[PDB]
PDB file of C-alpha atoms and ligand atoms in Angstrom:
ATOM      1  CA  UNK A1126    -102.698 -10.775 -41.341  1.00  0.00           C
ATOM      2  CA  UNK A1127    -103.837  -8.794 -44.375  1.00  0.00           C
ATOM      3  CA  UNK A1128    -104.901  -5.745 -42.352  1.00  0.00           C
ATOM      4  CA  UNK A1129    -102.749  -4.453 -39.523  1.00  0.00           C
ATOM      5  CA  UNK A1130    -103.224  -1.637 -37.058  1.00  0.00           C
ATOM      6  CA  UNK A1131     -99.647  -0.347 -36.948  1.00  0.00           C
ATOM      7  CA  UNK A1132    -100.464   2.023 -34.115  1.00  0.00           C
ATOM      8  CA  UNK A1133    -103.172   4.004 -32.392  1.00  0.00           C
ATOM      9  CA  UNK A1134    -103.375   6.566 -29.600  1.00  0.00           C
ATOM     10  CA  UNK A1135    -106.437   6.780 -27.422  1.00  0.00           C
ATOM     11  CA  UNK A1136    -107.307   9.695 -25.145  1.00  0.00           C
ATOM     12  CA  UNK A1137    -109.799  10.009 -22.339  1.00  0.00           C
ATOM     13  CA  UNK A1138    -110.499  11.110 -18.813  1.00  0.00           C
ATOM     14  CA  UNK A1139    -112.417  13.531 -16.652  1.00  0.00           C
ATOM     15  CA  UNK A1140    -112.324  16.930 -18.304  1.00  0.00           C
ATOM     16  CA  UNK A1141    -111.268  15.413 -21.605  1.00  0.00           C
ATOM     17  CA  UNK A1142    -113.152  15.063 -24.903  1.00  0.00           C
ATOM     18  CA  UNK A1143    -112.237  11.466 -25.914  1.00  0.00           C
ATOM     19  CA  UNK A1144    -110.232  10.970 -29.091  1.00  0.00           C
ATOM     20  CA  UNK A1145    -108.120   8.478 -30.962  1.00  0.00           C
ATOM     21  CA  UNK A1146    -105.575   8.268 -33.763  1.00  0.00           C
ATOM     22  CA  UNK A1147    -105.113   5.222 -35.947  1.00  0.00           C
ATOM     23  CA  UNK A1148    -102.530   4.055 -38.425  1.00  0.00           C
ATOM     24  CA  UNK A1149    -103.439   0.904 -40.314  1.00  0.00           C
ATOM     25  CA  UNK A1150    -101.726  -0.808 -43.216  1.00  0.00           C
ATOM     26  CA  UNK A1151    -103.620  -2.611 -45.962  1.00  0.00           C
ATOM     27  CA  UNK A1152    -102.330  -3.676 -49.377  1.00  0.00           C
ATOM     28  CA  UNK A1153     -99.129  -1.623 -49.291  1.00  0.00           C
ATOM     29  CA  UNK A1154    -101.074   1.485 -48.336  1.00  0.00           C
ATOM     30  CA  UNK A1155    -100.995   3.189 -44.937  1.00  0.00           C
ATOM     31  CA  UNK A1156    -103.979   5.095 -43.612  1.00  0.00           C
ATOM     32  CA  UNK A1157    -103.758   7.607 -40.791  1.00  0.00           C
ATOM     33  CA  UNK A1158    -106.887   9.038 -39.203  1.00  0.00           C
ATOM     34  CA  UNK A1159    -108.187  10.807 -36.126  1.00  0.00           C
ATOM     35  CA  UNK A1160    -111.564  11.384 -34.535  1.00  0.00           C
ATOM     36  CA  UNK A1161    -113.364  12.269 -31.345  1.00  0.00           C
ATOM     37  CA  UNK A1162    -115.991  10.025 -29.777  1.00  0.00           C
ATOM     38  CA  UNK A1163    -118.059   9.660 -26.606  1.00  0.00           C
ATOM     39  CA  UNK A1164    -115.465   7.240 -25.319  1.00  0.00           C
ATOM     40  CA  UNK A1165    -111.970   6.148 -26.263  1.00  0.00           C
ATOM     41  CA  UNK A1166    -113.054   3.014 -28.122  1.00  0.00           C
ATOM     42  CA  UNK A1167    -115.916   4.898 -29.693  1.00  0.00           C
ATOM     43  CA  UNK A1168    -113.418   7.499 -30.909  1.00  0.00           C
ATOM     44  CA  UNK A1169    -111.234   4.663 -32.198  1.00  0.00           C
ATOM     45  CA  UNK A1170    -114.176   3.163 -34.098  1.00  0.00           C
ATOM     46  CA  UNK A1171    -115.126   6.542 -35.566  1.00  0.00           C
ATOM     47  CA  UNK A1172    -111.598   6.969 -36.910  1.00  0.00           C
ATOM     48  CA  UNK A1173    -111.578   3.386 -38.156  1.00  0.00           C
ATOM     49  CA  UNK A1174    -114.848   3.927 -40.041  1.00  0.00           C
ATOM     50  CA  UNK A1175    -113.443   6.800 -42.108  1.00  0.00           C
ATOM     51  CA  UNK A1176    -110.754   4.351 -43.242  1.00  0.00           C
ATOM     52  CA  UNK A1177    -112.972   1.362 -43.983  1.00  0.00           C
ATOM     53  CA  UNK A1178    -115.411   3.585 -45.898  1.00  0.00           C
ATOM     54  CA  UNK A1179    -112.518   4.652 -48.126  1.00  0.00           C
ATOM     55  CA  UNK A1180    -111.574   1.005 -48.616  1.00  0.00           C
ATOM     56  CA  UNK A1181    -115.187   0.085 -49.339  1.00  0.00           C
ATOM     57  CA  UNK A1182    -115.286  -2.192 -46.298  1.00  0.00           C
ATOM     58  CA  UNK A1183    -118.473  -2.396 -44.245  1.00  0.00           C
ATOM     59  CA  UNK A1184    -117.991  -2.779 -40.478  1.00  0.00           C
ATOM     60  CA  UNK A1185    -120.426  -5.162 -38.706  1.00  0.00           C
ATOM     61  CA  UNK A1186    -122.636  -3.751 -35.991  1.00  0.00           C
ATOM     62  CA  UNK A1187    -121.429  -4.218 -32.423  1.00  0.00           C
ATOM     63  CA  UNK A1188    -124.012  -6.484 -30.744  1.00  0.00           C
ATOM     64  CA  UNK A1189    -122.400  -7.372 -27.408  1.00  0.00           C
ATOM     65  CA  UNK A1190    -119.338  -6.133 -25.505  1.00  0.00           C
ATOM     66  CA  UNK A1191    -117.856  -8.266 -22.709  1.00  0.00           C
ATOM     67  CA  UNK A1192    -114.863  -7.607 -20.470  1.00  0.00           C
ATOM     68  CA  UNK A1193    -113.448  -9.933 -17.825  1.00  0.00           C
ATOM     69  CA  UNK A1194    -110.329 -10.498 -15.729  1.00  0.00           C
ATOM     70  CA  UNK A1195    -109.128 -13.549 -13.818  1.00  0.00           C
ATOM     71  CA  UNK A1196    -110.142 -13.632 -10.116  1.00  0.00           C
ATOM     72  CA  UNK A1197    -107.837 -11.548  -7.956  1.00  0.00           C
ATOM     73  CA  UNK A1198    -106.199 -10.194 -11.098  1.00  0.00           C
ATOM     74  CA  UNK A1199    -105.628  -6.716  -9.620  1.00  0.00           C
ATOM     75  CA  UNK A1200    -105.021  -3.356 -11.295  1.00  0.00           C
ATOM     76  CA  UNK A1201    -102.540  -4.663 -13.870  1.00  0.00           C
ATOM     77  CA  UNK A1202    -104.741  -7.667 -14.749  1.00  0.00           C
ATOM     78  CA  UNK A1203    -104.851  -9.100 -18.266  1.00  0.00           C
ATOM     79  CA  UNK A1204    -108.181  -8.185 -19.790  1.00  0.00           C
ATOM     80  CA  UNK A1205    -110.208 -10.532 -21.985  1.00  0.00           C
ATOM     81  CA  UNK A1206    -112.551  -8.539 -24.223  1.00  0.00           C
ATOM     82  CA  UNK A1207    -115.131 -10.390 -26.260  1.00  0.00           C
ATOM     83  CA  UNK A1208    -117.006  -8.433 -28.881  1.00  0.00           C
ATOM     84  CA  UNK A1209    -119.984  -9.921 -30.662  1.00  0.00           C
ATOM     85  CA  UNK A1210    -120.701  -8.740 -34.195  1.00  0.00           C
ATOM     86  CA  UNK A1211    -123.509  -8.970 -36.750  1.00  0.00           C
ATOM     87  CA  UNK A1212    -123.176  -8.269 -40.495  1.00  0.00           C
ATOM     88  CA  UNK A1213    -126.882  -7.665 -41.063  1.00  0.00           C
ATOM     89  CA  UNK A1214    -130.311  -8.016 -39.000  1.00  0.00           C
ATOM     90  CA  UNK A1215    -130.797 -11.291 -36.953  1.00  0.00           C
ATOM     91  CA  UNK A1216    -128.747 -14.280 -35.782  1.00  0.00           C
ATOM     92  CA  UNK A1217    -127.330 -16.284 -38.840  1.00  0.00           C
ATOM     93  CA  UNK A1218    -124.380 -13.851 -39.307  1.00  0.00           C
ATOM     94  CA  UNK A1219    -123.443 -13.251 -35.699  1.00  0.00           C
ATOM     95  CA  UNK A1220    -119.866 -13.905 -34.662  1.00  0.00           C
ATOM     96  CA  UNK A1221    -117.374 -13.020 -31.940  1.00  0.00           C
ATOM     97  CA  UNK A1222    -113.743 -11.950 -31.872  1.00  0.00           C
ATOM     98  CA  UNK A1223    -111.569 -11.726 -28.795  1.00  0.00           C
ATOM     99  CA  UNK A1224    -108.625  -9.751 -27.522  1.00  0.00           C
ATOM    100  CA  UNK A1225    -106.398 -10.193 -24.474  1.00  0.00           C
ATOM    101  CA  UNK A1226    -104.092  -7.433 -23.241  1.00  0.00           C
ATOM    102  CA  UNK A1227    -102.982  -5.550 -20.065  1.00  0.00           C
ATOM    103  CA  UNK A1228    -104.783  -2.429 -21.356  1.00  0.00           C
ATOM    104  CA  UNK A1229    -108.523  -2.881 -21.741  1.00  0.00           C
ATOM    105  CA  UNK A1230    -108.736  -0.509 -24.696  1.00  0.00           C
ATOM    106  CA  UNK A1231    -105.963  -2.256 -26.620  1.00  0.00           C
ATOM    107  CA  UNK A1232    -107.755  -5.539 -25.951  1.00  0.00           C
ATOM    108  CA  UNK A1233    -110.788  -4.074 -27.729  1.00  0.00           C
ATOM    109  CA  UNK A1234    -108.650  -2.775 -30.618  1.00  0.00           C
ATOM    110  CA  UNK A1235    -107.211  -6.275 -31.014  1.00  0.00           C
ATOM    111  CA  UNK A1236    -110.661  -7.912 -31.081  1.00  0.00           C
ATOM    112  CA  UNK A1237    -111.659  -5.327 -33.675  1.00  0.00           C
ATOM    113  CA  UNK A1238    -108.542  -5.987 -35.784  1.00  0.00           C
ATOM    114  CA  UNK A1239    -109.307  -9.692 -35.733  1.00  0.00           C
ATOM    115  CA  UNK A1240    -112.824  -8.932 -36.896  1.00  0.00           C
ATOM    116  CA  UNK A1241    -111.465  -6.816 -39.752  1.00  0.00           C
ATOM    117  CA  UNK A1242    -109.284  -9.633 -41.077  1.00  0.00           C
ATOM    118  CA  UNK A1243    -111.996 -12.286 -40.711  1.00  0.00           C
ATOM    119  CA  UNK A1244    -114.208 -10.077 -42.861  1.00  0.00           C
ATOM    120  CA  UNK A1245    -111.422  -9.418 -45.370  1.00  0.00           C
ATOM    121  CA  UNK A1246    -110.072 -12.968 -45.347  1.00  0.00           C
TER     122      UNK A1246
ATOM    123  CA  UNK B 381    -118.302  13.314  -0.885  1.00  0.00           C
ATOM    124  CA  UNK B 382    -115.073  13.624   1.109  1.00  0.00           C
ATOM    125  CA  UNK B 383    -112.547  12.902  -1.646  1.00  0.00           C
ATOM    126  CA  UNK B 384    -112.986  14.385  -5.112  1.00  0.00           C
ATOM    127  CA  UNK B 385    -111.145  13.495  -8.301  1.00  0.00           C
ATOM    128  CA  UNK B 386    -111.140  16.892 -10.035  1.00  0.00           C
ATOM    129  CA  UNK B 387    -109.539  15.634 -13.226  1.00  0.00           C
ATOM    130  CA  UNK B 388    -107.565  12.840 -14.834  1.00  0.00           C
ATOM    131  CA  UNK B 389    -106.152  12.178 -18.287  1.00  0.00           C
ATOM    132  CA  UNK B 390    -105.507   8.692 -19.518  1.00  0.00           C
ATOM    133  CA  UNK B 391    -103.514   7.685 -22.569  1.00  0.00           C
ATOM    134  CA  UNK B 392    -102.993   4.289 -24.132  1.00  0.00           C
ATOM    135  CA  UNK B 393    -102.841   2.570 -27.481  1.00  0.00           C
ATOM    136  CA  UNK B 394    -100.553   0.512 -29.668  1.00  0.00           C
ATOM    137  CA  UNK B 395     -97.068   2.003 -29.802  1.00  0.00           C
ATOM    138  CA  UNK B 396     -97.658   4.055 -26.665  1.00  0.00           C
ATOM    139  CA  UNK B 397     -96.627   3.457 -23.054  1.00  0.00           C
ATOM    140  CA  UNK B 398     -99.838   3.683 -20.969  1.00  0.00           C
ATOM    141  CA  UNK B 399     -99.811   6.678 -18.641  1.00  0.00           C
ATOM    142  CA  UNK B 400    -102.263   8.772 -16.660  1.00  0.00           C
ATOM    143  CA  UNK B 401    -102.533  12.000 -14.708  1.00  0.00           C
ATOM    144  CA  UNK B 402    -104.810  12.602 -11.755  1.00  0.00           C
ATOM    145  CA  UNK B 403    -105.795  15.640  -9.734  1.00  0.00           C
ATOM    146  CA  UNK B 404    -107.739  15.064  -6.537  1.00  0.00           C
ATOM    147  CA  UNK B 405    -108.953  17.166  -3.629  1.00  0.00           C
ATOM    148  CA  UNK B 406    -108.847  15.812  -0.073  1.00  0.00           C
ATOM    149  CA  UNK B 407    -109.116  17.620   3.272  1.00  0.00           C
ATOM    150  CA  UNK B 408    -108.259  20.993   1.773  1.00  0.00           C
ATOM    151  CA  UNK B 409    -105.314  19.737  -0.285  1.00  0.00           C
ATOM    152  CA  UNK B 410    -104.861  19.394  -4.028  1.00  0.00           C
ATOM    153  CA  UNK B 411    -102.797  16.422  -5.183  1.00  0.00           C
ATOM    154  CA  UNK B 412    -101.470  16.062  -8.721  1.00  0.00           C
ATOM    155  CA  UNK B 413     -99.649  12.985  -9.970  1.00  0.00           C
ATOM    156  CA  UNK B 414     -98.604  11.088 -13.074  1.00  0.00           C
ATOM    157  CA  UNK B 415     -97.498   7.538 -13.793  1.00  0.00           C
ATOM    158  CA  UNK B 416     -97.153   4.796 -16.363  1.00  0.00           C
ATOM    159  CA  UNK B 417     -98.813   1.404 -16.018  1.00  0.00           C
ATOM    160  CA  UNK B 418     -99.599  -1.754 -17.987  1.00  0.00           C
ATOM    161  CA  UNK B 419    -102.874  -0.177 -18.995  1.00  0.00           C
ATOM    162  CA  UNK B 420    -104.553   3.192 -18.685  1.00  0.00           C
ATOM    163  CA  UNK B 421    -106.536   2.248 -15.596  1.00  0.00           C
ATOM    164  CA  UNK B 422    -103.445   0.568 -14.220  1.00  0.00           C
ATOM    165  CA  UNK B 423    -101.479   3.788 -14.790  1.00  0.00           C
ATOM    166  CA  UNK B 424    -104.314   5.713 -13.139  1.00  0.00           C
ATOM    167  CA  UNK B 425    -104.214   3.533  -9.999  1.00  0.00           C
ATOM    168  CA  UNK B 426    -100.397   3.729  -9.924  1.00  0.00           C
ATOM    169  CA  UNK B 427    -100.661   7.497  -9.894  1.00  0.00           C
ATOM    170  CA  UNK B 428    -103.448   7.315  -7.306  1.00  0.00           C
ATOM    171  CA  UNK B 429    -101.347   5.020  -5.141  1.00  0.00           C
ATOM    172  CA  UNK B 430     -98.591   7.617  -4.894  1.00  0.00           C
ATOM    173  CA  UNK B 431    -101.156   9.979  -3.407  1.00  0.00           C
ATOM    174  CA  UNK B 432    -102.728   7.454  -1.058  1.00  0.00           C
ATOM    175  CA  UNK B 433     -99.277   6.350   0.094  1.00  0.00           C
ATOM    176  CA  UNK B 434     -98.524   9.945   1.072  1.00  0.00           C
ATOM    177  CA  UNK B 435    -101.831  10.103   2.946  1.00  0.00           C
ATOM    178  CA  UNK B 436    -101.195   6.817   4.731  1.00  0.00           C
ATOM    179  CA  UNK B 437    -104.133   5.242   2.961  1.00  0.00           C
ATOM    180  CA  UNK B 438    -103.903   1.647   1.740  1.00  0.00           C
ATOM    181  CA  UNK B 439    -106.029   0.952  -1.338  1.00  0.00           C
ATOM    182  CA  UNK B 440    -108.215  -2.191  -1.328  1.00  0.00           C
ATOM    183  CA  UNK B 441    -107.047  -4.928  -3.698  1.00  0.00           C
ATOM    184  CA  UNK B 442    -109.019  -5.175  -6.941  1.00  0.00           C
ATOM    185  CA  UNK B 443    -110.511  -8.685  -7.010  1.00  0.00           C
ATOM    186  CA  UNK B 444    -113.015  -8.562  -9.856  1.00  0.00           C
ATOM    187  CA  UNK B 445    -113.730  -6.163 -12.730  1.00  0.00           C
ATOM    188  CA  UNK B 446    -117.011  -6.050 -14.673  1.00  0.00           C
ATOM    189  CA  UNK B 447    -117.936  -4.017 -17.733  1.00  0.00           C
ATOM    190  CA  UNK B 448    -121.296  -4.008 -19.500  1.00  0.00           C
ATOM    191  CA  UNK B 449    -123.215  -1.939 -22.009  1.00  0.00           C
ATOM    192  CA  UNK B 450    -127.013  -1.877 -22.279  1.00  0.00           C
ATOM    193  CA  UNK B 451    -128.784  -4.248 -24.703  1.00  0.00           C
ATOM    194  CA  UNK B 452    -128.745  -2.983 -28.271  1.00  0.00           C
ATOM    195  CA  UNK B 453    -125.001  -2.505 -28.357  1.00  0.00           C
ATOM    196  CA  UNK B 454    -123.429   0.447 -30.145  1.00  0.00           C
ATOM    197  CA  UNK B 455    -119.862   1.798 -30.245  1.00  0.00           C
ATOM    198  CA  UNK B 456    -120.931   4.966 -28.383  1.00  0.00           C
ATOM    199  CA  UNK B 457    -122.813   2.992 -25.702  1.00  0.00           C
ATOM    200  CA  UNK B 458    -122.855   4.000 -22.037  1.00  0.00           C
ATOM    201  CA  UNK B 459    -120.634   1.761 -19.954  1.00  0.00           C
ATOM    202  CA  UNK B 460    -121.545   0.382 -16.571  1.00  0.00           C
ATOM    203  CA  UNK B 461    -118.547  -0.822 -14.580  1.00  0.00           C
ATOM    204  CA  UNK B 462    -118.714  -2.774 -11.330  1.00  0.00           C
ATOM    205  CA  UNK B 463    -115.490  -3.342  -9.427  1.00  0.00           C
ATOM    206  CA  UNK B 464    -115.066  -5.691  -6.479  1.00  0.00           C
ATOM    207  CA  UNK B 465    -112.502  -4.943  -3.785  1.00  0.00           C
ATOM    208  CA  UNK B 466    -111.153  -6.723  -0.740  1.00  0.00           C
ATOM    209  CA  UNK B 467    -108.889  -5.643   2.103  1.00  0.00           C
ATOM    210  CA  UNK B 468    -115.234  -7.567   0.186  1.00  0.00           C
ATOM    211  CA  UNK B 469    -117.607  -5.036  -1.388  1.00  0.00           C
ATOM    212  CA  UNK B 470    -118.568  -3.472  -4.737  1.00  0.00           C
ATOM    213  CA  UNK B 471    -118.666  -0.038  -6.359  1.00  0.00           C
ATOM    214  CA  UNK B 472    -120.160   1.082  -9.657  1.00  0.00           C
ATOM    215  CA  UNK B 473    -119.509   3.632 -12.372  1.00  0.00           C
ATOM    216  CA  UNK B 474    -121.535   4.710 -15.413  1.00  0.00           C
ATOM    217  CA  UNK B 475    -119.954   6.624 -18.296  1.00  0.00           C
ATOM    218  CA  UNK B 476    -119.661   6.669 -22.128  1.00  0.00           C
ATOM    219  CA  UNK B 477    -115.883   6.178 -21.772  1.00  0.00           C
ATOM    220  CA  UNK B 478    -115.156   2.865 -20.074  1.00  0.00           C
ATOM    221  CA  UNK B 479    -111.940   4.001 -18.443  1.00  0.00           C
ATOM    222  CA  UNK B 480    -113.774   6.963 -16.910  1.00  0.00           C
ATOM    223  CA  UNK B 481    -116.494   4.577 -15.688  1.00  0.00           C
ATOM    224  CA  UNK B 482    -113.811   2.684 -13.740  1.00  0.00           C
ATOM    225  CA  UNK B 483    -112.371   5.905 -12.305  1.00  0.00           C
ATOM    226  CA  UNK B 484    -115.869   6.848 -11.087  1.00  0.00           C
ATOM    227  CA  UNK B 485    -116.184   3.522  -9.302  1.00  0.00           C
ATOM    228  CA  UNK B 486    -112.715   3.999  -7.867  1.00  0.00           C
ATOM    229  CA  UNK B 487    -113.751   7.427  -6.577  1.00  0.00           C
ATOM    230  CA  UNK B 488    -116.785   5.838  -4.942  1.00  0.00           C
ATOM    231  CA  UNK B 489    -114.693   3.114  -3.340  1.00  0.00           C
ATOM    232  CA  UNK B 490    -112.367   5.803  -1.994  1.00  0.00           C
ATOM    233  CA  UNK B 491    -115.096   7.860  -0.390  1.00  0.00           C
ATOM    234  CA  UNK B 492    -116.556   4.697   1.096  1.00  0.00           C
ATOM    235  CA  UNK B 493    -113.154   3.804   2.548  1.00  0.00           C
ATOM    236  CA  UNK B 494    -112.475   7.271   3.948  1.00  0.00           C
ATOM    237  CA  UNK B 495    -115.554   7.363   6.173  1.00  0.00           C
TER     238      UNK B 495
HETATM  239  C1  LIG C1710    -118.930  -0.441 -26.346  1.00  0.00           C
HETATM  240  C2  LIG C1710    -118.967   0.897 -25.605  1.00  0.00           C
HETATM  241  C3  LIG C1710    -117.599   1.582 -25.635  1.00  0.00           C
HETATM  242  C4  LIG C1710    -116.522   0.670 -25.045  1.00  0.00           C
HETATM  243  C5  LIG C1710    -117.655   2.908 -24.870  1.00  0.00           C
HETATM  244  N1  LIG C1710    -118.663   3.780 -25.485  1.00  0.00           N
HETATM  245  C6  LIG C1710    -116.287   3.590 -24.915  1.00  0.00           C
HETATM  246  O1  LIG C1710    -116.026   4.278 -25.927  1.00  0.00           O
HETATM  247  O2  LIG C1710    -115.530   3.411 -23.938  1.00  0.00           O
HETATM  248  C1  LIG C1711    -108.482  -4.366 -13.825  1.00  0.00           C
HETATM  249  C2  LIG C1711    -107.522  -4.498 -15.010  1.00  0.00           C
HETATM  250  C3  LIG C1711    -107.410  -3.187 -15.789  1.00  0.00           C
HETATM  251  C4  LIG C1711    -108.780  -2.749 -16.310  1.00  0.00           C
HETATM  252  C5  LIG C1711    -106.434  -3.344 -16.957  1.00  0.00           C
HETATM  253  N1  LIG C1711    -105.161  -3.877 -16.455  1.00  0.00           N
HETATM  254  C6  LIG C1711    -106.192  -1.975 -17.602  1.00  0.00           C
HETATM  255  O1  LIG C1711    -105.443  -1.187 -16.989  1.00  0.00           O
HETATM  256  O2  LIG C1711    -106.760  -1.752 -18.695  1.00  0.00           O
HETATM  257 ZN1   ZN C1712    -103.926  12.964 -27.694  1.00  0.00          ZN
HETATM  258 ZN1   ZN C1713    -100.433  11.988 -22.641  1.00  0.00          ZN
END
């Protein structure tokens, strides 16, 4: 845990321009950023990118996005989100991170946070 | 389309308690509700359930939930969500925001149930 997403607020809905706030801590420094996007997660990634650029960190390209719930999980089901990344470019640098949470967007933020640390660590 | 979801606002994140607002039109009546949940969509359905309960409508149980983006993945990718219900059928939603894609499928399920 060298990079932590202290908090984030994600907005979306019908009649709403999606947006997200982020507050991440890295090396005794806290970065707060906001951005709109075509979707909540997209907005979250756009805000994240302004931070990583500042830090000189390159974010891998999102190659695959998978979401699943256990059978008969229902509305409050735990969501498993698997995101596949690629640093370049073709297969040799492809990897996946995963997140599990009752909110599907948080699950994605968690998988993204894991990715960030794997790249930094 | 018999039932229309005029608007809805969903809010989640780390450090926030998931909540959602919904505004729907049915049989010449406007219904507006709010509620928290374990997740945005969960909050949305909790708010929807208050409405359906008032209408005497029982919502089908959510059995499976599928989310996919087209090949050549990108953060701003369109989301295609397929939800499976059982009292067993399926509804679909397509939208750049994945929570909205689910809501669209939920709206479809609703209209299909209120026939
Ligand atoms: C990977 C696609 C993402 C999840 C979608 N565009 C959203 O912001 O909801
Ligand atoms: C079907 C499970 C839903 C998507 C999840 N509990 C959420 O509200 O994010
Ligand atoms: Zn907001
Ligand atoms: Zn709010």
